[model samples]
Target: DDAIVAANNKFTLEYFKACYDEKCNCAVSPYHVRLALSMFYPLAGAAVQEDFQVAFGLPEDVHAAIEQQQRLAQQLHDGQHLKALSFVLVEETLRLDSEFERLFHRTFQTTVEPVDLTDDIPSALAVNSFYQRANTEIEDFIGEGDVFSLPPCHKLMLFSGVSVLTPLAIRFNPADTALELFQFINAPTQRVSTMHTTAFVRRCLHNELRCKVVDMPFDAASGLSMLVLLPYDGTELRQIVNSITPAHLAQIDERLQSCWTDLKLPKFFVREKTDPKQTLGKLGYGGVFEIDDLHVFHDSGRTRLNGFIQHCYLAVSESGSSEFEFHANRPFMFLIRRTMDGNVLQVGNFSKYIDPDEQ
Candidate 1:
């Protein structure tokens, strides 16, 4: 699938680079992150705003970029198994500019919901309920007492997907170690969490591999696939993660053309917790923590930012008809991608694997 998207936009490359530095096990929704950030772009100062654009290779005309993002959001939403959803919840006490709300709704196809965060336990419970009701994958993600320490003005952003494996037949691995537990080895060290055990397996027709490229399809006809690149295997995960670039991914795809490879992959389920505010802060947007003057909200001077939280989840369960082979139970990088457009629905790390029952 990386080949399909061999040439990604500028901002997308930069956004992935920034996230690689966080060093947390996370699943990223690049398009969703871009939409959430742009929601505040119109009201940002020129310097900080330009910095963001340049970092992500965004167009100078923010409005143009906004339109493109809307089109992409619709595309992602239309896919049966993949959708990038987001939310904006303002404190009930903080007022927003009418024009900003209208523009935001028009751009993202969703309105910002107002929630009560005035130390009322029910208010926090309501927020939790809202997220659970919106996405079936979410449960006990946040509790009533979690928001007490955050700033009074906050926003909630969510990106979740349930991608069904097309027709990749499944198998069972009898080793004590299983990929289902998120077990991965980034270095030469023998550190492993999942003792060898039985694991559900899946294999595709194209499992070609070379120095750095590994083109593995989830289901050839399903239009979903994965692209794996190594800053080579000897390097630390940090070094490899940091070294990834659009060019690197492009080259990987190019080398994988018409190659033969045998794949033995374990079923995996990923649910990584993240904070959008922290990610933006690393991108030089600290103003989110202190919202003093923003034209998007009413009485800008009095409006204060509370917090921003995001959670991403991805699951891989397959049932393939082909006989599988090989030993690839090691740390590697991958993307759950749509082959049709090469859209990366979810990006994550398989650092540790555990048996689902034990976990």
Candidate 2:
């Protein structure tokens, strides 16, 4: 009705006429405003509304969408991709036509802080401990904000601690599954756009492949961080996953690889730990990252894990300073890969974590 009456809108005609004589925030002539209202107003409103909704309370649309997803999740759990996808489309329209982002389906938020040298914790305790403290510290920093005073130095400490844990982003996410998620270390913006990632749904539907991605993070120095999700267990929706042909997985990998290449993801500076004599150095003014904490996940079920066809990191020389390093908590992307023979096995639950030395 709004759109139809809009065609014969004498009120619209007069409203636009008023713009020319009066002044308001838009300041454009009503003729221009009316001409652009349906297209520009809603488009512009969506951008602002999304930010406003998240900052304030959940928008009505957000609640409705979540309710719909809560229902679809049940379906997903029960192995109903077709039904789930239908609801997912409606949910997705909420993301597109409306103003909102998807909830935690394959999304995650990380907040990292830089740790100062003064904290009196053991080096052994420091690594994983950072992940937890980060959990709370981020909450506190955000909690205690003032319209006047800036965030405290602990914020800087937050940054440093995050740098320490980040090179290992691939190691966390036990709650999602033990599998590590890494962003496209580097990928082009256009190539790595959301369109390329939609296939992940098919993989999960058919192969029980689970994956997640955060809002894309682009560093001025490093193009964009791509999210990767890896799953640890095979829930028997056998045909979808177990029934997948080798050719199917490869086709998916190829499309993803192209996105990475386009983005120019950085390779590790070092080699795999399995090989003798190849190791990373200690952290210091003159140390490099050594992908330590090497552990294995094994299964006796005789099923092949998919990510391993090529799992590698280029351990690079980093400044190790409290200033120049990767940190947990800060947003990073996680990619989904299958465990081929060369890579580690699937350990879906991140909670199953075996402490490096503790194991």
Candidate 3:
């Protein structure tokens, strides 16, 4: 229950006059605070216009562009690669359906009624302007390290020429176009989407996160679930990965050679591979498995351990880093875990676990 309470400054009669817009100063009032606050309404209205609204001018093409982009991207929810989809086409497509612009600006709605933007000229243009400003704001935030510089303030302040304020009218308005923008940026946790797709994967990234390679060949392919974790005393670690729900496990299990329906203390071994540096214990990626769900590692026809209901990616991870990390409380998806002589390997939230030999 203990959390931190942060404050900018206390507002007193003296503080109002001191930091109060000097030009809006009022005389003959003991309640200098009331007078100072009164001058802020009109002044702040203008300030909001100049700083946030006007400076970031709206462009007309944005609305239609955004609508079309989202339509196409939604088709890839199942991991299918759309034909003739180039990087530029995807980028231009992304421009319209930018995650920041969408979750932070708009949303994935089947239909967005015409929004009456404050800019009042072209709605699409306003969307474009919004995109530009949003991108730049993020750029400045990353470049200046404004966000990383300090912890977030509880009540955010804008450069209003008036007092720090919250806009109840706009926030509560059912018809406001900017309401979605506010919900995406100002409200809590809208970006945390259900991580079932690559679109969803984008939500987990920070601005600094970037893919080292793109156009690395995209196609619709099936991936097997993986679980990874570190050992915990008693039943702590086992309980972590075992939290996977029976329904999702059944849903994902059919694709694998064997779903880990039951686990015993897997036999531990340290066999010699070709490399003197590699040991079976450390290089256990291809360690032969005698378990019901997992396969063995041998190339010979008779000795080979290639047993599975179907082909699947063999996933493995260390106990600590594996699926079912300590913090999770409920089962949301499929995960896999392997236990060998009290030491366990885990992988979680992964659909495919590529074996080292395959790579």
Superior by lDDT: candidate 1 or candidate 2 = 1
Best by TM-score: 1
Instruction: Give the alpha-carbon lDDT of every model.
Output: 0.52, 0.21, 0.19
Q: Write the per-residue lDDT of candidate 3 for residues 1-359, one digit (tens) a residue.
A: 00100000111112222222211211111111111111112212233222212211211234543443344234322221111110000112112223223432344322222222222233334333432342211111111111111222111111100110111110111221121110111232222212110111101111111101011011113111122222222332223233323232223223223211111111111111011011111322222212122111122111111110100112111121111112111111112111111101111221111223553
Q: Over the full model, what C-alpha lDDT does candidate 1 score relative to the true structure?
A: 0.52
Residue 304 error, candidate 1, Å: 6.4
lDDT of 1 by residue, 10-112 (tens): 3345555677632345566655666655666665666646655654445678787677656656765643345445655566666777766766766565446
TM-score winner, 1 or 3: 1
Candidate 3: C-alpha lDDT: 0.19
Error of 2 at 201 (Å): 15
RMSD of each: 5.7, 25.9, 30.6
How close to the true structure is residue 296 of candidate 2, measured as C-alpha lDDT? 12
**TM-score pick, better of 2 and 3:** 2
- Deviation in angstroms for 335 in model 3? 29
